[PDB]
Every structure is written in C-alpha cells, then in structure tokens.
Amino acid sequence: PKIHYRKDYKPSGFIINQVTLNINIHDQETIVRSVLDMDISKHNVGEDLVFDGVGLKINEISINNKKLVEGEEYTYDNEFLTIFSKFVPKSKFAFSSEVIIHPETNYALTGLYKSKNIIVSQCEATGFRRITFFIDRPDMMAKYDVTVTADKEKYPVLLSNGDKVNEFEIPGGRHGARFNDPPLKPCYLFAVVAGDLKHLSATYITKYTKKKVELYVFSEEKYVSKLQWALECLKKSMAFDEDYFGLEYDLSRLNLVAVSDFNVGAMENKGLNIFNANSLLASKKNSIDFSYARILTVVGHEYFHQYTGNRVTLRDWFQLTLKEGLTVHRENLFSEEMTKTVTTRLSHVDLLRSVQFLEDSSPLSHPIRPESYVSMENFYTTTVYDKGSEVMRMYLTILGEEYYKKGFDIYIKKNDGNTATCEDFNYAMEQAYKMKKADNSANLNQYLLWFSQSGTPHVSFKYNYDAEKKQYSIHVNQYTKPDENQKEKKPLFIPISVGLINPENGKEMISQTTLELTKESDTFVFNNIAVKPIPSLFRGFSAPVYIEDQLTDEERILLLKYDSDAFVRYNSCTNIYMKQILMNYNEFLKAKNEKLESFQLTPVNAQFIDAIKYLLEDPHADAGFKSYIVSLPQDRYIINFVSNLDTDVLADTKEYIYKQIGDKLNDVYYKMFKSLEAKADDLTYFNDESHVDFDQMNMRTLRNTLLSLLSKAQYPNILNEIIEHSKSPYPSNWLTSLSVSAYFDKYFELYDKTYKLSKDDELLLQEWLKTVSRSDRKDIYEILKKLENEVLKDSKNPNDIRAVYLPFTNNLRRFHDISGKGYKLIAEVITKTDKFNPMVATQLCEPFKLWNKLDTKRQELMLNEMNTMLQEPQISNNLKEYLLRLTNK
Ligand SMILES: N=C(N)c1ccc([C@H](N)P(=O)(O)O)cc1
Ligand SMILES: [Mg+2]
Ligand SMILES: [Mg+2]
Ligand SMILES: [Zn+2]
Q: Where is the active site?
C-alpha cells in the first residue's frame, strides 16, 4: 500500500480541459465512452501519462483517434493505465476510451451502481476512476458534457450536472439525454442518476438578484409522499445562507435525490445532491422524530457545500477539513437557528465529547489535517468533520458575528473559483482579527496548531478571591498528552467564553468576555468583583477541550440551577455525575477485586437530587434540557476517564446511581410523564406535512426518557402506561413502547405488533431493527439470530446491516460479555461485509475503537478478533489498513 504524504503535493504535468461522456446503460452492463481534451502543463517533464482507473474492462483506448496497442504503447493493471511517454503528444490532444462496468453487481456503492431500481453514481473521493479513466484528484478541473442513454421504461428520468440540452429517442425502446455543464469542476462532483423517479418541486426566488431557482426532490414512486419536509428544509437552507452569509444559489435548478443503498448520509455533486433515503425521507406516520432534525441537517449540509466545497475547491484531500469542518460549522449554525432549542448545540457537544474524544485518545488519533493517508475512504472521520467544525466555530467565537462574517466574505470573495488550503482560511480570519483588534501586528499564526496538532487539550482552573480588594483571579493551565504524532505538544490558542455568577441572586457580574489563553498558563484578574463569584466556564463549549472546572458540587449545583448558559448548566450536571461515577466505580471495583462479603457505596448527593427535582418541576424550564439532566453521561464519554475499564463494573455503577435517583424521584417522573402527554402527543398538525415543532418533539423525548427510567425501575403498574403508549400514532412513542417493554413479559407481543406497523416502509423497518437491536434483553443473542433469519437475511443494504448490529454494540453488559461472543459476532459481520462493501465493514469496526481502554481480559478478547480479521486472506485494503492502525501494528 502506497502512503500519500501531505508534504509531497505537486501539480499534475497534464491538463484535462474537457470531458465528453456517453454512458450507455444496458441490463447486463454499462458501456462508458469518454473523450478527454487534454494538454501538457507547465509542470510536465516528459513523464508517462498515468490515469486512474479501477475495475474497468477496456474495449479500446486511443490518442487523437488512433487506437493504442496494449503491451507496446500502454499497460493496465486494473488500477493505473500507463501510456508510455513516447506515445503521448506534446501539445493539445484528445484521449478517448471505451470501457465496460457493471453497476448491477457493484455492491461497494462507490462509482456507478444500482440501488434497487435506480442507477446512481458516488464519486467522492476516488469513485470517478471506477467509472472511466481520469487523473482522479480534486485539483484537475474540467468542463463536462454528459450523455446518458437507457431503457425508457426502466429509466424514464435521467439526470446529471448542468443544463439538460437534448433528449432523444433511441431504437429498441431506449432514450437519451445530454447535459452540459460549462463551469469547471473536479471529477468528484460529477454525478448521474437514472431511474423511475417521482418528484415534488417548488420555485425559489433569490433575495438579491431575484433569480428563479427550480427545486426538485426525487424518490422512487412508493415513497414520494415523504419528500415534503426535505423540500421545506432546502428552502430554509437557501434563506439561511442568504440571511447569515449573503450568499445566493448560482444555478437555475437544484435536484435532491433519495436512494435506498448509500454508504453515508449524502453527497454534494453540483446541482445534483444524492442522499441516503434515511436522510431525505420522512412522514409523521412512518418516521421517528429524529428523522426531522436529521433531514434538516443533511439537506442544509449538502446545500452549504455549494460554496464551501463546490465554488471554493480543495487543492488536495489533506485539506478535507477545510470543506467538511467548515460546512459542518455552517450546518450547525443553521440547525441551531432553525430549531431554536438549546439541545441542538448540546447534542453536537455530546457527540464530540463521546465519539470524537474517544477517537482522539485512540491509536487512530490524527489532527484535523493529517500528514499522510493510505486509504481516502477512511479519512472521513469525526475528527476531520466534528473537531474541524469546532475549530471553524472557534473563529466565530474569537471574532464575533460582524468580524467573523467579514472574514468569511474575505475568504469567499478571494478564493471563489480557485482551490484553497487551510492557511488561506486562516489568513482570511486573521485579516478580520487585525480589523477587530485594530492593529496589524496581531496575527493568528499560533491558531494553525489546531490544524496540525492531534489529541484533546486539557484545560484546568484554580481561583482566588480577595474580599477586601474585590479582586477575583482565574488561573488557567492547558496540557495536551503527547501521542504518536507529536512527542512535544505546543500550547494552543484557546478562547474561553466566561461569565461570573453571583451565588446570592444568580446574576451576571461581568459583561460577555472571552479569555484568549495563548500560553501554557495564564492568570486572568478581574477588579470590582463585589462578592466571590461562581465562574461559568467555556460557555457554549467554546473550545474542543477536556474541562477541569475544579468546582465543588455545591458550586456546580448553583450553576445548574442559576447560570444563563445551557452548556455550562449541562456540563456542571455532567461533572457532578462523573465525580459520582468514578467514586462508585472504584468502590465496586475494590469489592470485586478483594472478593468482599460486604462493603459500602457512597450515595448520590442529596442536594444534587433536589436540584434535579427543582428543574423538572419548573413549568418554564425546557423539556429537552430536562431530558439531558436525568440521563447519565454516555458510556463512551465515561471511558475517557477510567483506565482498564471493566464494563461490568461500569454497568453496576450506572445501575446504582440510576436507582439512587429513581428511589427519590420516580413519583416526580411519573407525574410529569402524565402531565406532558397532552402537549407532547398533540395531533393538531399530524396531517400537516410541513409543520415541524422541535419543542414538541423535545417533550416526546422527555416523556420517552422518563418512561424508560420508570420501566427499568419496575414502577408500580407502569406496564399499563407502556401498553397505552404502544397505541400512539407517533413512531417515536410506539417504538419506545417496544424497548421499554423489554423488562416485561409483554415484550414479544409488542415486538410483533410493532414489526407489523413497520414492515411495509423500508425506513421504518430499519428503525424497528435498531429498536430491537438496542432492546435491553437477556435473550438479546437469540433475538439477533431471529432478526438475521427472519428480516435481515442476505441484505447488502448498509442501512439494514448497520440497523441490526450497531445499536446492539452499545449494550454495555451484553455486547461486552466476558466470553467474547459479542466481539466474535461483530467480527464475523465485519468480515462478511468486507467481501462486498469495505467502507461499511470499516464502519462496523467502531466498537473496537476503544479496545485498548478496557480491562485486560476484554483488551485481549477484542485484539484476538481484530487479529483474526487481519488474517483473512481476502481482506480489503481498506479494512486491513484500518485494523493495522487500530491495533498498533
Ligand atoms: N467517501 C465517502 N463515503 C463520502 C464522503 C463525503 C461525502 C460528502 N463530502 P458529505 O460531507 O456527506 O457532504 C460523500 C461521500
Ligand atoms: Mg436576595
Ligand atoms: Mg430493501
Ligand atoms: Zn460534507
């Protein structure tokens, strides 16, 4: 396997100016004819002309309409086509080829492939070379002219980029359409779609130039009534980009297309965005609530790429975070603004601190701009995306909205229509930073360490208050643990949004303030502080760091009750829970280790319990927020703080803490579950396809969270509530009725009822699978085997595979069974999957990312499975490289 290093970037010694494609789709094969109008660049040195091309069957290749001779004038090895330089022209020339590919049997879902009865392409990052020969890298910009032909009755709708310029009948019941797209683009943005597609459409008129834009959303006929919310989300996305950024869509049409088989959420391809059906389609009847926010965020994300990926391009794939982390940042601003709920930002933080922190302390840790890769298919990571988004969001925290907007415009204005690197972004923010600080000595040079340095910084605090002097000091330290990528870690530029809360009346004591920590430590002093404050630190989660607030639980309770910032309130709660978790974990571990016949557990802080009750009972507090405070921190967040974590001891710790709080609050939880029903389950708008109320869905999350707490606690007669819940029209409710019924004899009756409600909608059935897979069942292994035999079977749909096995891997007691049978089961599924879809096989490795953080027995069991997979003679390059890096080989 070749290793690509970021420092080795050099421009191609060739130019491709024009691509002209003819893609002829037949039932047993697709013939692709391509003519590339090419040139020799100023960088050329008489080298062999080398095209990427993977899995292609050559019929013929030519230069200048002269057929080339295999062996004598070219070699092809199923990966690279080499045309020896003696046969390569020295001025403008045409390369042409005709190859055969087979989308029908393309189950890896990259290149051209068939999803149910739709043919669709997926080119990012290196799929275009699976379609035809090309210099398949994002700095090769070309014009595209694409003709598609196919059976008219099977494929009446043909789409590609640009303007449809011609449509034409072909003998034998076939038809064609030609699409010309004059603006330059990289090949990873080419797309083609052919299918019996149905649609909804609307016209959008842009804010400034008043241009009409036609919006089409497409799916197979069965699901066309689930397209309306996506169309609404698209309108919202366009308006947001206009409103916040002043940016208007440049083209006359935008197509969104849903397909059933897709490796990730969706893909921006210029004017032709293609989506996993689960991130485009929803209805109130056939979708769980989470689908609504998911579609808004993925539609927004792909729309925002139209500037941040599509009009300002990436020079090379090492700059991926510049398009992805910037677009996730824009997508997160948009969602926060559309949902208007504080839980939107909290949910982003929750994801970073569980999944991305776990990645950044694992053997796979990498900075958001890595120095090397082997597999581009494994470069699309929570680090590159979600820590990149926090890095891009820190610019806004530092600058504020006016100067951030100014600097963003500087970047867009200067790099619209060219490639770019992370430095150019940083330069643009710096110009805004000089303008903010009003001095041109000021720079963001140190900021660049956020791109290059791996690992999560740790930020810790000590405090001093002089009551006579009215003088308050915050002493701050930062530390990043050395790792494989830097032995010596340098201090980062860390912005710390802070408030000072008067603990007597709950009031802010200072104006908005963001501390700029730029050294390994600093002391920030504040005068005229009338009383000793409680500090509100990292408001909004203002940098991607481990926060060690060193506050007492009494101070944390005060913040939870009285602070103005949702994140700090939640983080204070989280810190109270972590202190409690680590204490009980250690008490349980000592008892197991010492084989104690009796021992004590530290109970949960009574005043913390009272503060939770105070918040739950407050009719003006937010239901979404309330759902966060009654939930312990995620298991993958906890693991960052325990060595050799024993998953059974953690499971007993959680069980103790939940029962401690439940023994005090379950009557409160019951009462709320009942009083919330009317508003949470309100049907007034159930038949209004465009009316989406995030606050109401947050009430359902709270009722469903409370119902789960009550069911695990076998609260008196709660089964009555569970059965009544099963009859709700909302799938979030009736699927919750399935999971919480696990603790009763009614489980299999609800399994059957809900299966019947789910089985005739492809996506709802996948949600039902997830609900079953995650059910807290002692017979969970037998239940998986029933799903395999009765529902999943031989499906190669990644949504089905992931739905059956991923939720199960979060089952702390059972997935981590000490026999290793859970690790064995997932490894078998990875290996089976890897035979046809290496990308999804790698995704299914996720449970193994924390292998080296568990107790020594479980480290050994997981390592044994990883080593078994690595020994498979037929292992993909993708899977092999991932498992080699994960196991530190
Ligand atoms: N290699 C892939 N699986 C892949 C990676 C990224 C993308 C898109 N960039 P996205 O960030 O959904 O917009 C689409 C597909
Ligand atoms: Mg008072
Ligand atoms: Mg299917
Ligand atoms: Zn993206």
A: 302
